[PDB]
Design a protein around this ligand. Structure first.
Ligand SMILES: *[C@@H]1O[C@H](CO)[C@@H](O)[C@H](O)[C@H]1NC(C)=O
Ligand SMILES: *[C@@H]1O[C@H](CO)[C@@H](O)[C@H](O)[C@H]1NC(C)=O
Lengths: 55, 168
């Protein structure tokens, strides 16, 4: 048990192309996207590990 | 060091010369003083500026995460970054030491060349004391002193006058 639960949710992702069509089919146990993330800006950046906050 | 002038035959520095890295001191009946040789100073400065610049320009050129199944890859990453780090730190520390050495010797050489210039100009019209000073065998006034300084000194003019005095 974690969070009370012995059940699990296994998540996968993908990058959908321009004009590409993605297709879902399930007889059960699908946890499905309502939304999806367009990339509105691209460029040099990263992820900084810190316990701090912005000033 | 190398050219044997700074901390050389010329035994110490002049706190009294504030206008330059290298220069003259003179005394005569007209007066006495320190004078920087502004040309040589500025030129050396330009050289040093070039040096440090070239050090900056040549040197002027994110993390990632990994799973627990990705131990070799992760380590490969680390060894790479660390490798490049070690290489650049080495290059910097080294470059700094060596160029420092070169720089001090460059200054020494500059002094030596200046002294030489004055000596080879004055010839036997003076005694060469070996402390960096020359004592004149003829009377040298401010015009003559400046002529020495500005590189124009006239040997034949003071020649036989110096001769007689050097002899008697
Ligand atoms: C998706 O819709 C657009 C409408 O602008 C169409 O031009 C495109 O061909 C469609 N893609 C597919 C794979 O059906
Ligand atoms: C150098 O200095 C002397 C003495 O002041 C002066 O008479 C002469 O014009 C100068 N010559 C040059 C070429 O700088």
């Amino acid at each position: 048990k974690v969070n009370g639960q012995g059940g699990r949710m296994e998540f996968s992702w993908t990058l959908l192309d321009m004009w590409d069509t993605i297709n879902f089919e399930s007889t059960g146990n699908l946890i499905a996207p309502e939304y999806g993330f367009k990339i509105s800006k691209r460029g040099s950046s990263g992820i900084m590990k810190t316990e701090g906050t912005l000033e | 060091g190398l050219f044997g002038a700074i901390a050389g035959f010329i035994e110490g520095g002049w706190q009294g010369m504030v206008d330059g890295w290298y220069g003259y001191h003179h005394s005569n009946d007209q007066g006495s003083g320190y004078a920087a040789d502004k040309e040589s100073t500025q030129k050396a400065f330009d050289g040093i500026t070039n040096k440090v610049n070239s050090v900056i320009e040549k040197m002027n050129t994110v993390g990632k995460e990994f799973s627990n199944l990705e131990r070799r890859l992760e380590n490969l990453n680390k060894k790479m970054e660390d490798g490049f780090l070690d290489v650049w730190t080495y290059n910097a520390e080294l470059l700094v030491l060596m160029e420092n050495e070169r720089t001090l010797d460059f200054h020494d050489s500059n002094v030596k060349n200046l002294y030489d210039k004055v000596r080879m100009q004055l010839r036997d019209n003076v005694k060469e004391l070996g402390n960096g000073c020359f004592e004149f065998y003829h009377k040298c006034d401010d015009e003559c002193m400046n002529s020495v300084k500005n590189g124009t000194y006239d040997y034949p003019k003071y020649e036989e006058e110096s001769k007689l005095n050097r002899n008697e």
